[PDB]
Amino acid sequence: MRVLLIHSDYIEYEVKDKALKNPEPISEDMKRGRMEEVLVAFISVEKVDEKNPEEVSLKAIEEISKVAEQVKAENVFVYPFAHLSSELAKPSVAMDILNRVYQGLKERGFNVGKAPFGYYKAFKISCKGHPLAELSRTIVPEEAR
Amino acid sequence: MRVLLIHSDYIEYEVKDKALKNPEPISEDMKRGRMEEVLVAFISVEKVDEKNPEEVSLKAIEEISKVAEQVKAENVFVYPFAHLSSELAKPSVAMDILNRVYQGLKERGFNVGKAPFGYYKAFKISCKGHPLAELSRTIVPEE
Numbered sequence: 501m502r503v504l505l506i507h508s509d510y511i512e513y514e515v516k517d518k519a520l521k522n523p524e525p526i527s528e529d530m531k532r533g534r535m536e537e538v539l540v541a542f543i544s545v546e547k548v549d550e551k552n553p554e555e556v557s558l559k560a561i562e563e564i565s566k567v568a569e570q571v572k573a574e575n576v577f578v579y580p581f582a583h584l585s586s587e588l589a590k591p592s593v594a595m596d597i598l599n600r601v602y603q604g605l606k607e608r609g610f611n612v613g614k615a616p617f618g619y620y621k622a623f624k625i626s627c628k629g630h631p632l633a634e635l636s637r638t639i640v641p642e643e644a645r
Numbered sequence: 646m647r648v649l650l651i652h653s654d655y656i657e658y659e660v661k662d663k664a665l666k667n668p669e670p671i672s673e674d675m676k677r678g679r680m681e682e683v684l685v686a687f688i689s690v691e692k693v694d695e696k697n698p699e700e701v702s703l704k705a706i707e708e709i710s711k712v713a714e715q716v717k718a719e720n721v722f723v724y725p726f727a728h729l730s731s732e733l734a735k736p737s738v739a740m741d742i743l744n745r746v747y748q749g750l751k752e753r754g755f756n757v758g759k760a761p762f763g764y765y766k767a768f769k770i771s772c773k774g775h776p777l778a779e780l781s782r783t784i785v786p787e788e
C-alpha cells in the first residue's frame with residue numbers, strides 16, 4: 501500500500517464517470533463531496549496487500565492516525581487513488597481494505613470522510629504547505645517486507 | 646525517481662520559507678506562481694537516481710512528454726515534491742536532475758513552468774478527473 505498524506509484547507513471531489521464495471525453503489529447526492537481542514541489520505545492498495553488485508557489495514561490506520569495527531573488534524577479523508585502505484589490489488593480487495601481503514605480511523609475518534617470507490621473523480625485540494633503537510637507512507641505485510 | 650502526474654485545470658503555489666540550508670535563490674516574483682490547463686509533474690528524486698542523473702533525467706522527460714501527448718496538454722509544470730518517496734537523493738543532485746528534466750521538456754517544445762527548489766510550499770491544484778488525469782511513474786536507472 502502506498503499512501504500520500506496532504507494536510508489541506510479543504511478537499512472537494514466530483515464524480516465524472518465509472519472507472520470499473522461495478523463500482524461502489526452510491527446515491528446522487530454523493531456525486532460531489534467536500535471536507536474542510538483535513539488530512540487527505542490518497543491511498544493505492546497494492547497487490548502485495550492481498551497477502552494480509554487486516555495487517556495492512558491496521559498499519560494504515562496507525563500511520564495515518566499518527567500524522568493526524570502531529571498536525572492536529574481533526575478531520576481525515578480516505579481518498580481511493582489507485583494510480584499512486586503500478587501494481588494494484590484487485591478492486592474487491594482494495595474496497596475491503598479501504599473500508600477497514602475508514603472504520604478504524606472512525607473508531608480512533610476522528611471525523612472521517614471518504615470519496616466513492618470505483619470512479620473517475622475530479623478533485624480540488626489546497627495543501628497548507630507546513631513542515632509535515634506532505635508525507636508519504638509505504639505499508640506492506642510483514643512477510644512481504 | 647518517483648513522479649506523480651496530475652492533468653489539471655490549474656496549479657498555484659506559494660513559497661513559505663526554506664526547508665534546506667541552501668535553497669535555490671529566488672526573487673520576490675518567484676515566491677508565487679500559477680499555470681492553467683497543465684500537466685503537473687510532482688517529482689521526488691531518489692537516492693537510486695544518483696547513480697546516473699543523465700539516464701534518469703532522459704527517461705523522465707520521455708515519460709512525462711508521452712503522458713502530455715496522451716492527455717493533449719501543451720503546458721507542463723515541474724514541481725519539486727520530495728515527499729513522494731522515502732529514499733531521497735542528495736539535494737545538489739536532486740536540483741540538477743529537476744533542472745535537467747525542466748529543460749528537457751522545454752526542448753520538446755512544451756510551455757514549461759517550475760517551482761523553486763528547497764522550500765516549504767503551499768499549493769492548490771484542481772485535477773480534471775478524466776481518464777489518464779492521474780498517473781504515476783517509478784523511474785530507476787540500473788546503470
Ligand SMILES: C[C@@H](O)[C@H](N)C(=O)N[C@H]1[C@@H](O)[C@H](n2cnc3c(N)ncnc32)O[C@@H]1CO
Nearest residue numbers: 519545580581582589594617618619620621
Ligand atoms: C481514476 C481516478 O480518477 C480515481 N481517483 C481512482 O483512483 N479511482 C479508482 C478507485 O476509486 C478504485 N480502485 C480500484 N483499484 C484500486 C486500488 N487498488 N486502490 C485504490 N483504489 C482503487 O476504482 C477506481 C479505478 O481504479
Ligand SMILES: C[C@@H](O)[C@H](N)C(=O)N[C@H]1[C@@H](O)[C@H](n2cnc3c(N)ncnc32)O[C@@H]1CO
Nearest residue numbers: 664689690725726727734739762763765766
Ligand atoms: C517541503 C514541501 O512543502 C515541498 N513541496 C518540498 O518537497 N520541498 C523540497 C524540494 O523543494 C527540495 N528537495 C530536496 N530533496 C529533494 C528530492 N530528493 N526531490 C525533490 N525535491 C527535493 O527541497 C525541499 C525540502 O526537502
